[PDB]
Motif scaffolding. Structure first.
Motif, PDB file in Angstrom:
ATOM      1  N   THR A  25       0.790  -1.224   0.000  1.00 30.37           N
ATOM      2  CA  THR A  25       0.000   0.000   0.000  1.00 30.37           C
ATOM      3  C   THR A  25       0.818   1.267   0.000  1.00 30.37           C
ATOM      4  O   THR A  25       0.263   2.358   0.009  1.00 30.37           O
ATOM      5  CB  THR A  25      -0.966   0.046   1.200  1.00 30.37           C
ATOM      6  N   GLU A  26       2.137   1.129  -0.014  1.00 27.55           N
ATOM      7  CA  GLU A  26       3.004   2.291  -0.024  1.00 27.55           C
ATOM      8  C   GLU A  26       2.862   3.100  -1.313  1.00 27.55           C
ATOM      9  O   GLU A  26       2.731   2.552  -2.412  1.00 27.55           O
ATOM     10  CB  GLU A  26       4.465   1.858   0.175  1.00 27.55           C
ATOM     11  N   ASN A  27       2.880   4.417  -1.162  1.00 27.67           N
ATOM     12  CA  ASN A  27       2.790   5.333  -2.284  1.00 27.67           C
ATOM     13  C   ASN A  27       1.427   5.333  -2.974  1.00 27.67           C
ATOM     14  O   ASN A  27       1.308   5.717  -4.138  1.00 27.67           O
ATOM     15  CB  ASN A  27       3.894   5.031  -3.294  1.00 27.67           C
ATOM     16  N   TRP A  87       9.428  -8.486   3.619  1.00 24.50           N
ATOM     17  CA  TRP A  87       9.677  -7.182   4.221  1.00 24.50           C
ATOM     18  C   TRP A  87      10.511  -6.314   3.279  1.00 24.50           C
ATOM     19  O   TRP A  87      11.199  -6.818   2.392  1.00 24.50           O
ATOM     20  CB  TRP A  87      10.374  -7.335   5.581  1.00 24.50           C
ATOM     21  N   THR A  88      10.460  -5.007   3.479  1.00 23.83           N
ATOM     22  CA  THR A  88      11.179  -4.101   2.607  1.00 23.83           C
ATOM     23  C   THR A  88      12.485  -3.558   3.174  1.00 23.83           C
ATOM     24  O   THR A  88      13.096  -4.144   4.069  1.00 23.83           O
ATOM     25  CB  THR A  88      10.271  -2.917   2.221  1.00 23.83           C
ATOM     26  N   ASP A  89      12.904  -2.430   2.609  1.00 25.90           N
ATOM     27  CA  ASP A  89      14.121  -1.731   2.997  1.00 25.90           C
ATOM     28  C   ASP A  89      14.078  -1.368   4.479  1.00 25.90           C
ATOM     29  O   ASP A  89      15.107  -1.343   5.138  1.00 25.90           O
ATOM     30  CB  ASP A  89      14.303  -0.461   2.124  1.00 25.90           C
ATOM     31  N   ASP A  90      12.888  -1.079   4.998  1.00 27.92           N
ATOM     32  CA  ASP A  90      12.751  -0.740   6.407  1.00 27.92           C
ATOM     33  C   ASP A  90      13.390  -1.850   7.249  1.00 27.92           C
ATOM     34  O   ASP A  90      14.325  -1.598   8.009  1.00 27.92           O
ATOM     35  CB  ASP A  90      11.273  -0.572   6.792  1.00 27.92           C
ATOM     36  N   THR A  91      12.906  -3.080   7.110  1.00 31.03           N
ATOM     37  CA  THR A  91      13.452  -4.196   7.883  1.00 31.03           C
ATOM     38  C   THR A  91      14.919  -4.483   7.569  1.00 31.03           C
ATOM     39  O   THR A  91      15.681  -4.882   8.447  1.00 31.03           O
ATOM     40  CB  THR A  91      12.643  -5.491   7.642  1.00 31.03           C
ATOM     41  N   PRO A 151      14.992  -3.238  -4.706  1.00 28.73           N
ATOM     42  CA  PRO A 151      13.960  -2.729  -5.611  1.00 28.73           C
ATOM     43  C   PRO A 151      13.217  -1.553  -5.008  1.00 28.73           C
ATOM     44  O   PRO A 151      12.559  -0.790  -5.715  1.00 28.73           O
ATOM     45  CB  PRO A 151      13.012  -3.923  -5.780  1.00 28.73           C
ATOM     46  N   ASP A 152      13.344  -1.398  -3.698  1.00 29.52           N
ATOM     47  CA  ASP A 152      12.606  -0.363  -2.996  1.00 29.52           C
ATOM     48  C   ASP A 152      13.417   0.595  -2.143  1.00 29.52           C
ATOM     49  O   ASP A 152      12.863   1.261  -1.266  1.00 29.52           O
ATOM     50  CB  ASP A 152      11.584  -1.040  -2.106  1.00 29.52           C
ATOM     51  N   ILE A 153      14.717   0.668  -2.381  1.00 28.40           N
ATOM     52  CA  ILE A 153      15.545   1.559  -1.591  1.00 28.40           C
ATOM     53  C   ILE A 153      15.164   3.017  -1.844  1.00 28.40           C
ATOM     54  O   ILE A 153      14.857   3.394  -2.973  1.00 28.40           O
ATOM     55  CB  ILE A 153      17.028   1.337  -1.911  1.00 28.40           C
ATOM     56  N   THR A 210       2.907   3.987   4.070  1.00 30.39           N
ATOM     57  CA  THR A 210       2.268   3.010   4.950  1.00 30.39           C
ATOM     58  C   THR A 210       3.240   2.030   5.558  1.00 30.39           C
ATOM     59  O   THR A 210       3.128   1.683   6.728  1.00 30.39           O
ATOM     60  CB  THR A 210       1.175   2.197   4.220  1.00 30.39           C
ATOM     61  N   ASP A 211       4.195   1.558   4.765  1.00 31.63           N
ATOM     62  CA  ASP A 211       5.178   0.592   5.247  1.00 31.63           C
ATOM     63  C   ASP A 211       5.995   1.087   6.446  1.00 31.63           C
ATOM     64  O   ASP A 211       6.265   0.326   7.372  1.00 31.63           O
ATOM     65  CB  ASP A 211       6.102   0.203   4.077  1.00 31.63           C
ATOM     66  N   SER A 212       6.383   2.358   6.437  1.00 36.25           N
ATOM     67  CA  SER A 212       7.164   2.903   7.539  1.00 36.25           C
ATOM     68  C   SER A 212       6.247   3.257   8.712  1.00 36.25           C
ATOM     69  O   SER A 212       6.615   3.088   9.879  1.00 36.25           O
ATOM     70  CB  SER A 212       7.957   4.124   7.066  1.00 36.25           C
TER      71      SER A 212
END
Ligand SMILES: [Mg+2]
Length: 301
Positions: free
Chosen positions: A25-27, A59-63, A96-98, A254-256
């Protein structure tokens, strides 16, 4: 004691789970989330800009950056060299999401330049919970390691002031602390780094409806958007699940938002209070478990 383990196990998995649930749901705006998925209640296959780039439950760049900071931790604190080198390692793996900020910052770290870029993006605050865990008692020591670990990347007062509020709330959550008096205490804890931001946290005292809160502060990547409204979700919900649904359906970054809410909510509510469907649905739990065991050991002594 035995509760400490549930809380820490809940805080880490709370952060990673929120990060993965918010990934799709990010962006996206609230209208977009509804159309693309309707009400998000669990992991979903991405239809945003990450479609194809990441599979659901991941999980993304956050994790990733958080895993970096966790591996460079000890009782002595954060080992900046080991930290920067790990960030670089991930950065060179072609994420891919940095984020743009993380990109520019991990670039200067390659040139042994630890001055960091100057942006108020939540890059620093999305990976700070591990400190809030290990140093829940030593608020002075936490502050030191917090500014230190996030200065090298986000040398911005607002960015730093934000990571502090979070670390602050994570440690308080670990002490079964969860009330609005925390807002006036955190304010004093960070105001000496950014009075304008800290003064923004105090505005949460005037809201009771998260929807308006998100529409007031905002849910974008700017630290003075996601951090305050994430802290606000934590304080304005009564159980782990309730808060996260608000986060992942909020729209924006949303992710952060989700990841930060989960770190606090996880710490306070505990692992056993996390919906089992969000635990089974997470991918690669063994890596997170090992990292959770670590923080537990560090915090336990
Ligand atoms: Mg992200």
């Amino acid at each position: 004691l035995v509760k400490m383990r549930d809380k820490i196990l809940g805080s880490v998995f709370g952060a990673v789970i929120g990060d993965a649930l918010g990934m799709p749901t990010e962006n996206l705006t609230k209208e977009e989330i509804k159309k693309l998925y309707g009400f998000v209640d669990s992991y979903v296959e991405p239809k945003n800009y990450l479609a194809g780039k990441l599979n659901k439950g991941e999980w993304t760049d956050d994790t990733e950056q958080a895993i970096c900071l966790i591996k460079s931790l000890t009782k002595e604190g954060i080992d900046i060299k080991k930290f920067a080198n790990c960030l670089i390692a991930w950065k060179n793996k072609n994420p891919p999401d940095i984020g743009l900020t993380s990109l520019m910052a991990i670039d200067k770290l390659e040139n042994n330049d630890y001055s960091g870029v100057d942006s108020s993006s939540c890059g620093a605050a999305m990976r700070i919970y591990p400190l809030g865990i290990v140093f829940h008692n030593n608020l002075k020591k936490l502050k030191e390691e917090v500014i230190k670990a996030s200065k090298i990347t986000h040398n911005n007062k607002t960015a730093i002031a934000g990571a502090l509020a979070i670390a602050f709330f994570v440690s308080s959550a670990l002490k079964d602390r969860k009330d609005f008096s925390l807002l006036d205490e955190c304010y004093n804890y960070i105001k000496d780094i950014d009075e304008e931001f800290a003064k923004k946290l105090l505005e949460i005292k005037n809201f009771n409806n998260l929807d308006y809160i998100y529409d007031y502060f905002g849910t974008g990547v700017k630290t003075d958007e996601v951090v305050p409204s994430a802290i606000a979700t934590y304080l304005l919900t009564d159980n782990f699940k309730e808060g996260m649904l608000k986060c992942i359906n909020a729209g924006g970054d949303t992710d952060s938002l989700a990841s930060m809410y989960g770190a606090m909510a996880g710490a306070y509510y505990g692992f056993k209070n996390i919906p089992k469907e969000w635990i089974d649905g997470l991918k690669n739990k063994e890596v997170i478990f090992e990292l959770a065991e670590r923080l537990y050991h560090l915090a336990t002594e």
